Enzyme design. Structure first.
Site, PDB file in Angstrom:
ATOM      1  N   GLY A  44       0.680  -1.346   0.008  1.00 14.73           N
ATOM      2  CA  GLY A  44      -0.073   0.048   0.140  1.00 14.73           C
ATOM      3  C   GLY A  44       0.886   1.134   0.073  1.00 14.73           C
ATOM      4  N   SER A  49       3.716   7.233   3.731  1.00 10.79           N
ATOM      5  CA  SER A  49       4.327   6.282   3.501  1.00 10.79           C
ATOM      6  C   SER A  49       4.235   5.211   2.519  1.00 10.79           C
ATOM      7  CB  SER A  49       4.556   5.376   5.135  1.00 10.79           C
ATOM      8  OG  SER A  49       3.269   4.629   5.287  1.00 10.79           O
ATOM      9  N   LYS A  66       7.852  -0.281   6.410  1.00  6.71           N
ATOM     10  CA  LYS A  66       7.170   0.987   6.064  1.00  6.71           C
ATOM     11  C   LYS A  66       8.299   2.050   5.614  1.00  6.71           C
ATOM     12  CE  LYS A  66       3.977   4.077   8.793  1.00  6.71           C
ATOM     13  NZ  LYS A  66       3.099   4.097  10.010  1.00  6.71           N
ATOM     14  N   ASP A 154      -5.950   8.248  15.310  1.00  4.52           N
ATOM     15  CA  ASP A 154      -5.916   7.869  14.017  1.00  4.52           C
ATOM     16  C   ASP A 154      -6.554   6.636  14.021  1.00  4.52           C
ATOM     17  OD1 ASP A 154      -6.381   8.446  11.356  1.00  4.52           O
ATOM     18  OD2 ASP A 154      -4.295   7.510  10.762  1.00  4.52           O
TER      19      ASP A 154
HETATM   20  C1  LIG Z   1       0.697   2.432   7.611  1.00  4.28           C
HETATM   21  O1  LIG Z   1       1.482   2.155   8.927  1.00  4.28           O
HETATM   22  C2  LIG Z   1       1.656   0.886   9.286  1.00  4.28           C
HETATM   23  C3  LIG Z   1       1.171  -0.367   8.496  1.00  4.28           C
HETATM   24  C4  LIG Z   1       1.739  -1.496   9.053  1.00  4.28           C
HETATM   25  C5  LIG Z   1       1.018  -2.619   8.183  1.00  4.28           C
HETATM   26  C6  LIG Z   1       0.357  -2.516   7.115  1.00  4.28           C
HETATM   27  C7  LIG Z   1      -0.032  -4.158   6.354  1.00  4.28           C
HETATM   28  C8  LIG Z   1       0.486  -5.215   6.828  1.00  4.28           C
HETATM   29  O2  LIG Z   1      -0.744  -4.121   5.247  1.00  4.28           O
HETATM   30  C9  LIG Z   1       2.248  -1.793  10.113  1.00  4.28           C
HETATM   31  C10 LIG Z   1       2.706  -0.637  10.926  1.00  4.28           C
HETATM   32  C11 LIG Z   1       2.397   0.604  10.673  1.00  4.28           C
HETATM   33  O3  LIG Z   1       2.555   1.781  11.186  1.00  4.28           O
END
Ligand SMILES: COc1cc(/C=C/C(C)=O)ccc1O
EC number: 2.7.11.1
Length: 328
Positions: A44, A49, A66, A154
């Site tokens: 994503g 990020s 990330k 959030d």
């Molecule tokens: C967008 O921020 C995060 C995302 C994820 C994992 C996202 C997934 C596994 O799709 C883990 C820690 C974070 O701070």
């Protein structure tokens, strides 16, 4: 001016912590080895990020990486310091490493792997019991971070990662999280629109942990009533009107009057007059198996205009709604 506000719990946690705990601008990052991690696929991209599935080749284990987009050194250090403070807490995503990405020239946060079930599809199948169970698991994370002097700011389904197979949950994306300091004024441009508390929507800056409890309430309403999102505003103004059509305008005025807050005059033309509604009107034959008097009372005690009147995370865990949840 506006009447000041204080959190009713965990008010002075940072006051009595050593300065290094909350002074994130002075944090010195311990960098790991970036060659330890091989990116596998992009999961994503957000405003702040890009997120990748990766492998840690020192143990051949899946991790999540990330890679932060360029932003204030401060916002980056803030998230890092908050993740390190909260590491090991119940249902908090675990920061495993921090490396410098050679391409982005920014930090890449490495997390424990989490095997997600997409919430839009997950929320379609959740049983009454499932909802109670996962709500309790979110409360554990929120009571923990609040007890540690941090508000998430959030809370939304996207940031609650659930491995439904192992009944495992993680609260993620601490990129908007902040340290709570009594009397501090905060930016109201936080949280996703549908999950913004009334305090944000009326521009009251001296808010606290209780903001997360409003967002949680919005999540609960969408789950037990099967309407996601529950308060579906087209912008931040209409968002408050949507809320007032349910909670009523007289209690909204009581709220802003208590803190001597003035509404944006642009509300004069759109707000109207609205009675407070009973929660039963949102119940129907397709969601009634998810609703109980306990669920409605719990929801009612989360979704309060007055941030000071909302259940705290710990009080929420005491609620009869969780009596049927099996305790470990
Ligand atoms: C967008 O921020 C995060 C995302 C994820 C994992 C996202 C997934 C596994 O799709 C883990 C820690 C974070 O701070």
């Amino acid at each position: 001016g506006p009447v000041p506000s204080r959190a009713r719990v965990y008010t002075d946690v940072n006051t009595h912590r050593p300065r290094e705990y909350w002074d994130y601008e002075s944090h010195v990052v311990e960098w790991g080895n970036q060659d330890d991690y091989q990116l596998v696929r992009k999961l994503g991209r957000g405003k702040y990020s890009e997120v990748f599935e990766a492998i840690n080749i020192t143990n051949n284990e899946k991790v999540v990486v990330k890679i932060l987009k360029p932003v204030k050194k401060k916002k980056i250090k803030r998230e890092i310091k908050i993740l390190e403070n909260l590491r090991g807490g119940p249902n908090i995503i675990t920061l495993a490493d921090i490396v410098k990405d050679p391409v982005s020239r920014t930090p890449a946060l490495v997390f424990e792997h989490v095997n997600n079930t997409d919430f839009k599809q997950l929320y379609q199948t959740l049983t009454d019991y499932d909802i109670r169970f996962y709500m309790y698991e979110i409360l554990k994370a929120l009571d923990y971070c609040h007890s540690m002097g941090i508000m998430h700011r959030d809370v939304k389904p996207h940031n609650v990662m659930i491995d439904h197979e192992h009944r495992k949950l993680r609260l993620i994306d601490w990129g908007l999280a902040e340290f709570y300091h009594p009397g501090q004024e905060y930016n109201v441009r936080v949280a996703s629109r549908y999950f913004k508390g009334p305090e944000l929507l009326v521009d009251y800056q001296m808010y606290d942990y209780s903001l997360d409890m409003w967002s949680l309430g919005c999540m609960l309403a969408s789950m037990i009533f099967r309407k996601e999102p529950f308060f579906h505003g087209h912008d931040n103004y209409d968002q408050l009107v949507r809320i007032a059509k349910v909670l009523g305008t007289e209690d909204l005025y009581d709220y802003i009057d208590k803190y001597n807050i003035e509404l944006d005059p642009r509300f004069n033309d759109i707000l109207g007059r609205h009675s407070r509604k009973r929660w039963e009107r949102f119940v129907h034959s397709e969601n009634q198996h998810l609703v109980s008097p306990e669920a409605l009372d719990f929801l009612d005690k989360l979704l309060r205009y007055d941030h000071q009147s909302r259940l705290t995370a710990r009080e929420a865990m005491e609620h009869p709604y969780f009596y049927t949840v099996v305790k470990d």
